[PDB]
Design a protein around this ligand. Structure first.
Ligand SMILES: O=C(NCCc1ccncc1)c1ccccc1F
Ligand SMILES: O=C(NCCc1ccncc1)c1ccccc1F
Lengths: 304, 304
């Protein structure tokens, strides 16, 4: 009973966080096996960040210029390389707390947990989604770069995000753990405007199913619709188009509630057209879109 | 930049979660030093729960009837006792992962992190508040009892909540780690209705300060008020009375923004009277009350 914005337990990731300092810049690194991953902008002065040539700046850096601290113990850097927008610092000690892990590149609308860190130390954990414009709406201050986003599948941590920057609009951009930015963003202090932050329709529908499972049912109506009709309304309200693939993904929730996906679409259509009228769904006055169908099933079934 | 509902990192608590089985009932226990704490209702059949005499039911239980499993290793129970509504199972092995800890009894309006567990295994972490009616709005399924609520102060875990039950209205009740229920609730399957779930005014004001710090400023108005005038409006809207103690607690946020507490009260008064008019504050269409002033300062300053 009840439905919360829920993060994965963070312990397995806490065991991987280190501090990386290059000159006067301190941020976070991820220590897996004998490699520490961090944003390549650790090598930049705030001045460098206006138009950095990373290959040229990196030539001036030696292994001994990368200070890596795990708790209050220094790690020995025996190699460094740049992969896209991350540095890989090879250290002489494998992290003894390395969990089973994968690097995965997520799609827009997929959710993940962020372990916000400063100076290699965990401050908090929260749940994010990759937005359709490839931003995330995080909570990050100076020093949080290198904080990571992840999912867990029982005992395997899938790392999907590393924090790199804040856009002038206070939204966040970063990379996968291969160093490739999500979306069109670059690690330079320049004009980078985000595109339309559309609503993740399939996630909203998942969350309406979660609401019905948890006894919030007032928005259920007498109507149905078609994908094409629903999509006309979605487009008007800057919702993502719903595909048959999304309908298929919602099948288990439909079966759990006995509410046909297209009937739930017709409920969502009325909520878009009519508003909430001062009512709430699962404690929200807006339609929540940062739960995936998989998240709803996981939280409604108590997976560990 | 940005502001998220943020939980404490959970690793230190993950290291304390065990499974407790008595007959056919499995739930979670908290293993600190050589004691495992769990809800006393572990000894009840669902039938027992209608009118349990816990002293009488416990007479039929021996140490060897309490099965305690830490990961896939059995712990040896060498003593048991009932303290209020918790059992303390003395085991022959001190938890090697025991963090620095305290047991604290929180006040209504105080927030904490919950590590939701099943079979002694962590499923997720989320942020809660003790409601003014001494319920919490959690996310708990069968098997989640004994899951705990906590705060961290650097390296010391203050445990404040252990999950015991779900009211017919789908809200949650539990104890401190001395086994005393929050509010009037009992560990019996009976008629237990919650009182008014009033809004935690001081937390709303904290969150409006968080909003201004993070650039959401549209709701700032030209007005001020007095505690007495504000309180007339609070009472009308089922908000908690604001006290001078709350004004004093908001002092650092007032100083950080240069917005007098009573000016922010006048902004909140207009939001109550006028509504949001389809606008959002920090991604919310309602006034959020599960961030304390301490939470806002912590998240806005990046404490680890
Ligand atoms: O440090 C600052 N801004 C960068 C914050 C940031 C957030 C998220 N990810 C990366 C970096 C700052 C501090 C004080 C005053 C003005 C500022 F601009
Ligand atoms: O197991 C059930 N309900 C108790 C859940 C619960 C939640 C939170 N804290 C303690 C207990 C249940 C399962 C299937 C059908 C009907 C039910 F009632």
């Amino acid at each position: 009973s009840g439905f919360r914005k829920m993060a994965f337990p963070s312990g397995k990731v806490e065991g991987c966080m280190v501090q990386v300092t290059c000159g006067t810049t301190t941020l976070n690194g991820l220590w897996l096996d004998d490699v520490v991953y961090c944003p390549r902008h650790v090598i930049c002065t705030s001045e460098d960040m206006l138009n950095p040539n990373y290959e040229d700046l990196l030539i001036r850096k030696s292994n001994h210029n990368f200070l890596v601290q795990a708790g209050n113990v220094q790690l020995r850097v025996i190699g460094h390389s740049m992969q896209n927008c991350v540095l890989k610092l090879k250290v002489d000690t494998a992290n003894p707390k390395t969990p089973k892990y994968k690097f995965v590149r997520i799609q827009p609308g997929q959710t993940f947990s962020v372990l916000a860190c400063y100076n290699g130390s965990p401050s908090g954990v929260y749940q994010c989604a990759m937005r359709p414009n490839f931003t995330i709406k995080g909570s990050f201050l100076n020093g949080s770069c290198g904080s990571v986003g992840f999912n867990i599948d029982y005992d395997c941590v899938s790392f999907c995000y590393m924090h790199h920057m804040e856009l002038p609009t206070g939204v966040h951009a970063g990379t996968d753990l291969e160093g490739n930015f999500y979306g069109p963003f670059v690690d330079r202090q320049t004009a980078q405007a985000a595109g339309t932050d559309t609503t993740i329709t399939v996630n909203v529908l998942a969350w309406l199913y979660a609401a019905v499972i948890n006894g919030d049912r007032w928005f259920l109506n007498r109507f149905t619709t078609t994908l094409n009709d629903f999509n006309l309304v979605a487009m008007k309200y800057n919702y993502e188009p719903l595909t048959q693939d999304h309908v298929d993904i919602l099948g288990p929730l439909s079966a759990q509630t006995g509410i046909a996906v297209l009937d739930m679409c017709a409920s969502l259509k009325e909520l878009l057209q009519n508003g909430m009228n001062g009512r709430t769904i699962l404690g929200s006055a807006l339609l929540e879109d940062e739960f995936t169908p998989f998240d709803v099933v996981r939280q409604c079934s108590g997976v560990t």
